[PDB]
Symmetry: C3
Subunit: 222 residues, 3 copies
């Protein structure tokens, strides 16, 4: 079942990527960079999850789905970049703030991988550092990054706030699932975790960019 | 013989790099960034191939994986594409989105090759196939939108770009052909043959390309 | 012993990072990017050294201990330190990102040669070490050559500051490969504990010390 679920995921990623490419052909005031980001996220996640489908992106230590971390270390920082560019739409870009988020995010995923490879107190030290990174990301998202959004007008700010809440809601789910699942306290069955890390990603990897791009495109007056 | 061939390669890379450094001292209208790219490519490939020469950059899997090649290509090949892209954009506005589109496709391509090499049966050829699809999309961009940018920068620049585009594209298709025929693929070609092919081709791609490229661009100065 | 030393280091890194964050809140004409760089360096080094403290960032090889977490640290921290130095030279002027990424490239290569050298034995080890030393020399030539000339182009006061931080960092730079060569990774003249202490103390001066000197000097140039 696990194999089939991952094959299906990879196919949905491919479909999402194609949709964003088609949108890119009639961009409606949205820079090409934002379409490229939107496309890379699902395509990369697709490849990683395909490796799991083929029975390659995991090993025994319990089952460590290391392919997930290879996925997130690229996809999650790109998702943050997309959100940041949305905040900066119609204004001057703050790449310092953007790369601040990328750095925090990459560290977050790495702590997760190390934590998964760790046992006892060591595991939860790394997990904890990752959670601290996530909190700082959330503070930036609803603090200085939102103030940039507000500096770019009512309509843009309204869209940013919507996508910020969307992504933030999914963000908190991942570390919650991790902790409850076999990687953490082991309260949740492996199959449950597998389904959670199939469904969430669909909403984060494709869902987010659909909401984001449509909202931005709507700001265009042709 | 394999060790000696790699030592010789590394020496040629060193010579090529030094030549490009000398050219950089009297740049003739070519930005410093394009000389830096030209220098990093051979120097990086040189180091990687030196590791093989020393008997480090390979392991047994029951064939020999020259993993040092993938370490080389994951850096050298995206830089080669960047160089080609900047050539197209010479004298005009740069499209970094298109450039990083090519880098992304290229890095993915090399990774699929590494995974394919570590894979067996149908799994190997799935990854190989994904890499081939990336290469095709790179070729479509190179002779499509990227060439149209070249054409927008004048007849003389376009003529040069088309020349270097065909040069690199010719070498590009050789690598996946050799891979498939050689021990990593169908195993029709002898290991020594593959070793020689992945010594000779790189010399034309890592040094040859930049010689042709830089000379052509420098010639546009007068 | 070794574990406790690394825990202490990680705490000092955290304190340094917090200090730079506080400075960033009242920037005094120093761009945000330079505060971000100043913060990432110690935070990253802290995390890496914490892994050693926990007994994860090291393994046995050649019957000796490879502290591989050091290389994970340096491959990120050392290029950021060079970027910081380069941006200092370019303070008040046009950026030369080509020169900057030239230094990053040389630096990343340098650290990698060190890792490979540490995994190597006999003549192979010292070939890699040698390639790393050549990279360091080219970095020093750039630092006191073209990069200093950029500093000079940005006025007497900035140039004076750059020269000071350039000498500071360059002095620490030569120490690392000297310690490596003398320690178990090289000739094995120095005991493991001696090397461990050197690669605890130097980093404190490089990862925190440098940015304290650098940021204070730059902030001083601010008129208000
Ligand atoms: C491209 C995007 C990410 C791909 C990851 C490949 C995962 C590695 C798959 C190779 C595993 C090899 C295998 O078959 O497993 C034996 C242990
Ligand atoms: C289980 C979901 C399966 C397939 C749909 C994949 C996409 C999931 C997200 C749907 C996009 C969305 O949220 O709707 C955006 C809306 O169309 C504009 O605002
Ligand atoms: C560009 C970055 C890497 C630079 C690398 C430069 C070295 C090139 C080798 C020269 C031949 C000398 C070694 C010949 C040894 C013969 C083989 C043997 O058995 O000894
Ligand atoms: C610089 C750019 C590339 C470097 C590749 C270095 C190749 C990595 C080689 C390390 C592996 C190694 O040394 O292990 C094999 C050998 O048995 C023990 O020396
Ligand atoms: C920033 C992260 C740096 C290093 C992580 C170190 C990874 C440590 C790997 C754990 C291996 C382990 O637990 O070994 C038993
Ligand atoms: C001191 C090295 C100085 C410069 C690097 C030049 C690189 C030259 C590489 C040649 C090394 C060589 O041939 O070494 C063979 C031996 O097997 C190895 O253990
Ligand atoms: C150790 C060596 C550093 C010795 C000091 C290096 C001084 C460099 C002077 C200089 O101008 O070097 C740049 C020049 O372009 C280069 O060819
Ligand atoms: C250990 C591996 C870590 C790799 C991390 C990779 C992170 C990739 C993310 C990059 C995001 C950069 C986006 C920049 C957008 C450009 C701004 C613009 O379009 O004007
Ligand atoms: C693991 C894979 C990582 C690949 C990294 C290799 C780097 C390839 C990227 C090169 C981009 C170069 C862009 C140069 C822009 C020049 C603009 C200018 O001259 O003003
Ligand atoms: C092995 C992976 C190594 C990757 C290196 C990571 C760090 C590289 C450092 C880059 C610093 C970039 C600084 C750019 C300066 C811009 C300043 C400005 O314009 O405001
Ligand atoms: C494995 C990766 C670990 C973390 C590395 C993080 C790298 C990025 C961090 C800092 C560099 C910031 C440089 C960007 C500033 C751009 C300024 C501008 O031009 O507006
Ligand atoms: C969980 C914690 C999330 C923290 C969110 C705090 C947002 C800060 C608001 C602001 O800075 O304006
Ligand atoms: C689920 C999303 C997680 C938490 C959202 C954080 C709430 C803080 C919002 C700050 C309010 C504000 O700045 O106006
Ligand atoms: C051996 C490979 C090294 C490269 C050296 C390049 C040879 C010189 C190019 C011709 C010079 C010219 O036509 O002006
Ligand atoms: C290691 C670093 C990994 C970086 C990410 C690479 C993954 C690439 C995936 C495919 C790239 C997407 C390109 C789509 C086509 C671009 C276009 O529209 O022209
Ligand atoms: C795109 C490829 C998807 C189809 C995968 C087929 C599975 C065969 C196998 O197990 O190797
Ligand atoms: C090898 C097979 C691949 C070939 C790809 C070349 C097709 C390029 C078409 C672009 C033409 C154009 O739009 O001008
Ligand atoms: C070997 C090179 C491989 C493929 C080259 C494809 C050339 C396609 C040309 C299309 C551009 C045109 O003629 O308008
Ligand atoms: C050994 C060096 C390798 C050379 C590859 C081919 C170089 C071709 C030189 C052409 C010169 C020119 O056209 O300006
Ligand atoms: C990973 C990338 C590392 C590549 C390794 C070596 C790069 C060497 C940089 C070349 C020095 C150029 C100096 C100059 O021209 O001023
Ligand atoms: C602002 C709204 C935030 C979310 C937007 C998109 C909707 C996401 C809803 C979450 C999807 C379900 C995730 C959990 C799946 C658990 C399945 C358990 C099966 C055993
Ligand atoms: C991996 C893709 C990351 C996005 C690259 C965007 C490049 C910037 C474009 C500026 C115009
Ligand atoms: C060894 C046995 C291989 C059997 C044939 C496999 C064909 C693979 C085709 C790849 C297509 C991938 C499309 C995505
Ligand atoms: C043993 C089966 C051989 C299958 C070869 C697959 C080749 C794929 C080529 C894609 C282009
Ligand atoms: C693996 C070796 C295959 C030999 C032939 C290579 C074909 C590419 C052109 C030369
Ligand atoms: C006891 C000392 C613990 C310090 C922890 C530092 C963590 C830095 C990661 C960022
Ligand atoms: C180890 C890297 C962790 C990321 C550090 C960056 C923190 C920046 C926070 C300040 C934003 C204003
Ligand atoms: C890392 C490898 C170095 C090659 C990248 C060159 C980029 C330089 C950008 C300068 C823009 C002006
Ligand atoms: C057991 C044999 C030990 C041999 C020692 C070799 C050390 C030589 C490396 C130090 C000198 C670096 C020079 C680099 C070129 C400038
Ligand atoms: C066993 C105690 C050894 C302590 C050695 C001293 C450590 C700090 C010395 C200052 C920095 C040295 C630089 C490397 C040479």
């Amino acid at each position: 079942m696990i194999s089939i679920l991952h094959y299906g995921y990879s196919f949905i990623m491919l479909l999402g990527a194609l949709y964003f490419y088609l949108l890119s052909k009639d961009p409606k005031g949205v820079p090409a960079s934002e379409y490229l980001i939107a496309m890379v996220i699902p395509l990369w996640s697709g490849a990683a999850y395909l490796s799991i489908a083929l029975g390659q992106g995991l090993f025994q230590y319990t089952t460590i789905y290391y392919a997930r971390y290879i996925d997130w270390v690229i996809s999650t920082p790109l998702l943050l970049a997309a959100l940041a560019l949305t905040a900066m739409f119609g204004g001057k870009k703050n790449l310092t703030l953007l790369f601040s988020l990328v750095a925090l995010d990459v560290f977050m995923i790495i702590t997760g991988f190390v934590a998964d490879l760790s046992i006892g107190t060591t595991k939860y030290i790394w997990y904890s550092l990752g959670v601290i990174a996530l909190i700082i990301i959330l503070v930036i998202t609803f603090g200085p990054l939102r103030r940039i959004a507000l500096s770019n007008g009512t309509r843009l700010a309204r869209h940013y706030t919507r996508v910020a809440i969307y992504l933030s809601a999914l963000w908190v789910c991942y570390p919650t699932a991790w902790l409850l699942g076999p990687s953490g306290l082991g309260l949740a069955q492996e199959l449950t975790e597998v389904l959670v890390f199939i469904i969430l990603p669909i909403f984060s990897k494709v869902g987010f960019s659909i909401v984001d791009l449509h909202g931005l495109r709507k700001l265009h007056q042709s």
